[PDB]
C-alpha cells in the first residue's frame, strides 16, 4: 500500500493545508451575499404644520 | 303727520329738535387691530416653515 509510504507524506500534508486552509477559504470570503434591497416607501419624519 | 296732529304745546318740536341734533354713538373697532397683528405674526411663522419645507 503506497498510502503507508510515510516518506512522501510531507508532500501531501503541506499543499493541502495551503489549499484547504488558505486558498479556498480566500475564495469563499470573496463570495459574499448582500441583504436584498426592500427600502420601505414609508420613511417621513414629518410634523403637523406650525400649530 | 306729527306737526298737524298733536295739540300739545310745541312738544313735538323739541323732541324733533333733540332728534336731528342727536349723535348716536358709532361703535369703534378696538378688536381688529389686534387680530391683524396676530395675522402678521402668523404669516411670519408660516413663511419660515415654507422656507424649511
Swiss-Prot record, chain A:
Q: Where are the transmembrane segments?
A: 8-21
- Complex and partners: Component of the ATP synthase complex composed at least of ATP5F1A/subunit alpha, ATP5F1B/subunit beta, ATP5MC1/subunit c (homooctomer), MT-ATP6/subunit a, MT-ATP8/subunit 8, ATP5ME/subunit e, ATP5MF/subunit f, ATP5MG/subunit g, ATP5MK/subunit k, ATP5MJ/subunit j, ATP5F1C/subunit gamma, ATP5F1D/subunit delta, ATP5F1E/subunit epsilon, ATP5PF/subunit F6, ATP5PB/subunit b, ATP5PD/subunit d, ATP5PO/subunit OSCP.
Q: Which family does it belong to?
A: Belongs to the ATPase protein 8 family.
- Please give an example of a GO cellular component term from this record: proton-transporting ATP synthase complex
Keyword Cell cycle assigned: no
Q: How does it sit in the membrane?
A: Single-pass membrane protein
Where is this gene product found?
Mitochondrion membrane
Alphabetically ordered keywords of this record: Acetylation, ATP synthesis, Cardiomyopathy, CF(0), Disease variant, Hydrogen ion transport, Ion transport, Membrane, Mitochondrion, Primary mitochondrial disease, Transmembrane, Transmembrane helix, Transport
Which source organism?
Answer: Homo sapiens
Its function? Answer: Subunit 8, of the mitochondrial membrane ATP synthase complex (F(1)F(0) ATP synthase or Complex V) that produces ATP from ADP in the presence of a proton gradient across the membrane which is generated by electron transport complexes of the respiratory chain. ATP synthase complex consist of a soluble F(1) head domain - the catalytic core - and a membrane F(1) domain - the membrane proton channel. These two domains are linked by a central stalk rotating inside the F(1) region and a stationary peripheral stalk.
Tell me a Gene Ontology molecular-function term this record carries. Answer: proton transmembrane transporter activity
Recorded superkingdom: Eukaryota
Major site of localization recorded for this protein: mitochondrion
Protein name, entry field:
ATP synthase F(0) complex subunit 8
Q: Which disease is it linked to?
A: Mitochondrial complex V deficiency, mitochondrial 2: A mitochondrial disorder with heterogeneous clinical manifestations including neuropathy, ataxia, hypertrophic cardiomyopathy. Hypertrophic cardiomyopathy can present with negligible to extreme hypertrophy, minimal to extensive fibrosis and myocyte disarray, absent to severe left ventricular outflow tract obstruction, and distinct septal contours/morphologies with extremely varying clinical course.
Protein encoded by which gene? MT-ATP8
> What Gene Ontology biological process does one annotation of this record name?
proton motive force-driven ATP synthesis
Swiss-Prot record, chain B:
Where's it found, cell-wise? Mitochondrion; Mitochondrion inner membrane
Q: Which gene encodes it?
A: ATP5PD
Quaternary structure annotation from Swiss-Prot or TrEMBL: Component of the ATP synthase complex composed at least of ATP5F1A/subunit alpha, ATP5F1B/subunit beta, ATP5MC1/subunit c (homooctomer), MT-ATP6/subunit a, MT-ATP8/subunit 8, ATP5ME/subunit e, ATP5MF/subunit f, ATP5MG/subunit g, ATP5MK/subunit k, ATP5MJ/subunit j, ATP5F1C/subunit gamma, ATP5F1D/subunit delta, ATP5F1E/subunit epsilon, ATP5PF/subunit F6, ATP5PB/subunit b, ATP5PD/subunit d, ATP5PO/subunit OSCP.
- Carrying N6-acetyllysine, the residues are 8, 17, 23, 30, 40
Q: Which organism is it from?
A: Homo sapiens (Human)
**N6-succinyllysine, modified sites:** 23, 30, 40
Q: Which residues form a coiled coil?
A: none
Family according to the record: Belongs to the ATPase d subunit family.
Q: Could you say which residues of the full protein are shown?
A: 56 to 108 of 161
Q: What does this protein do?
A: Subunit d, of the mitochondrial membrane ATP synthase complex (F(1)F(0) ATP synthase or Complex V) that produces ATP from ADP in the presence of a proton gradient across the membrane which is generated by electron transport complexes of the respiratory chain. ATP synthase complex consist of a soluble F(1) head domain - the catalytic core - and a membrane F(1) domain - the membrane proton channel. These two domains are linked by a central stalk rotating inside the F(1) region and a stationary peripheral stalk.
Q: What is this protein called?
A: ATP synthase peripheral stalk subunit d, mitochondrial
Amino acid at each position: 500500500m503506497p498510502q503507508l509510504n510515510t516518506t512522501v507524506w510531507p508532500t501531501m500534508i503541506t499543499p493541502m493545508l495551503l489549499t484547504l486552509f488558505l486558498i479556498t477559504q480566500l475564495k469563499m470570503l470573496n463570495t459574499n451575499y448582500h441583504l436584498p434591497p426592500s427600502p420601505k416607501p414609508m420613511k417621513m419624519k414629518n410634523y403637523n404644520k406650525p400649530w | 303727520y306729527y306737526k298737524a296732529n298733536v295739540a300739545k304745546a310745541g312738544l313735538v318740536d323739541d323732541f324733533e329738535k333733540k332728534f336731528n341734533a342727536l349723535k348716536v354713538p358709532v361703535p369703534e373697532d378696538k378688536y381688529t387691530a389686534q387680530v391683524d397683528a396676530e395675522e402678521k405674526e402668523d404669516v411670519k411663522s408660516c413663511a419660515e416653515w415654507v422656507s424649511l419645507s
